[PDB]
Ligand binder design. Structure first.
Ligand SMILES: Nc1ncnc2c1ncn2[C@@H]1O[C@H](CSCC[C@H](N)C(=O)O)[C@@H](O)[C@H]1O
Lengths: 265, 265
């Protein structure tokens, strides 16, 4: 009579940790959500096969409004698991579900899985150099989100890199590409005109991290804004001032233009 | 012709991903390094038995100075794995290892695993609010390094959280405790008197992340500085101003005093 929050990792069913798999195999009931991120290399069927259980998938409303009425009841009698893409507590509000579990008298445990937040290390950029992170959200109606632009500005003034989670509307099967996030940023730039994101800004794209062949590309917005980075999910990074070894990696591994090697210390 | 960078995850031998395990098993040769960190919840013997391969351990000098003479040669006609604690490439120097593989005409792929960078999401603190990260180093001889103190100050004045890695002598297996880190910081505060770390500063201590029973504690320095957080490894975090949901989690899950919901929000 326990609840496990188990991450499924970055790309496919095998990105689950061994810990997570052996525990999920022995749970009486398994629930999951696939709206906080997209695992482009697997299916519900392959996940069910691996864990050997029937997974019931919940929507954002099931989780946000009825988690305590749908999942918690069973965890009082049984050992229940709640699976999520990547790490369950990164760039989600699932941490709060722990609090609901405690007041329902249910003990909860967390099994981590690889997360996009640390997988950025594959870009060659020093992970300690990342500053505040932000989310590029799709505009809707007359509401046009722009706070993520200011995040970039603040980080870059400090010489820190900016990680940008891209929006996702899983019920619409919509996954924001790096391209779309660049276009949105250029628009915010025309408006605020702070010189923060232009045709000359160096960016880094990481798509489908976790796969054996993720797309890793670095370059100026003018040259990458229309490039095909493959299927989602995508993440966009606006680097701060680069260390030489960072630049060397972006060039050798991410095909960045030779000219970024000459940093302006 | 292939080199696999495989992460071992956070604490024990089950923290490797299913993908990482299966690939490691199909490799002709398996190397590991334990100089960037250790896997405090297991042993080399137990990891070897899980992988079903003898594992040759490499020292810092093995890697930094002779990676191309020890590892790359076998990867020319074999499948070779290089295991590292946490998520590969999060350690500042390992990304350039990929460049060496390239220069030697060797294919390389990265198999991710949970990292402390994402795992701290279990503290209930929003991942996006973390700013620049740093390492607390022991002073020694005539050298008193204090840059980590400066990192806290510039993150906190922007309302950002500071993730602090604590000094480790992997080879000697000596860990800096969160307690020592706190006293260190208090000493640096008395030196710089910038009002960044005092008895009244709120901190979060995460110990043995990855374990089913990690220690997560939150409170003021004056009450936590002599408390026993258990066995290493310890991670220290100095949160910036909290969102109410953050504070509620710290109170409900990490045993923080109610006081923070009116003092640090
Ligand atoms: N494998 C992957 N490759 C690239 N971006 C990814 C990714 N997985 C997640 N993301 C990014 O993160 C967003 C979801 S945010 C939720 C993240 C998740 N808890 C984790 O730990 O990874 C996506 O819209 C996308 O921009």
């Amino acid at each position: 009579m326990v609840l496990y929050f188990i991450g499924l990792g970055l790309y496919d069913e095998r990105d689950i940790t061994v810990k997570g798999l052996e525990i999920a195999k022995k749970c009486d009931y398994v629930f999951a959500e696939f709206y906080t991120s997209l695992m482009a290399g697997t299916t519900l069927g392959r996940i069910q096969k691996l864990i050997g259980k029937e997974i019931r998938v919940l929507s954002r409303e099931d989780v946000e409004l009825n988690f305590e009425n749908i999942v918690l009841p069973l965890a009082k009698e049984n050992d229940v698991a709640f699976l999520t893409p990547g790490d369950p507590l990164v760039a989600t509000t699932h941490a709060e579900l722990r609090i609901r579990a405690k007041r329902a008298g249910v003990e909860s445990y967390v099994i981590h899985a690889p997360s996009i937040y640390s997988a950025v290390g594959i870009t060659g950029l020093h992970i300690y150099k990342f500053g505040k992170s932000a989310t590029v959200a799709y505009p809707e109606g007359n509401w046009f989100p722009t706070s993520y632009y200011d995040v970039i500005k603040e980080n870059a003034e400090r010489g820190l890199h900016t990680l940008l989670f891209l929006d996702i509307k899983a019920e619409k099967r919509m996954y924001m590409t790096a391209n779309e996030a660049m276009e949105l940023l250029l628009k915010v730039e025309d408006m605020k005109k702070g010189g923060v994101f232009t045709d000359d800004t160096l960016v880094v794209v990481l798509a489908r991290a976790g796969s054996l062949n993720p797309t890793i590309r670095a370059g100026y917005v003018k040259d990458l804004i229309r490039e095909d980075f493959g299927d989602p999910p995508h993440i966009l990074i606006v680097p701060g001032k680069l260390h030489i070894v960072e630049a060397e990696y972006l060039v050798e591994i991410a095909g960045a233009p030779r000219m970024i090697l000459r940093v302006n210390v």
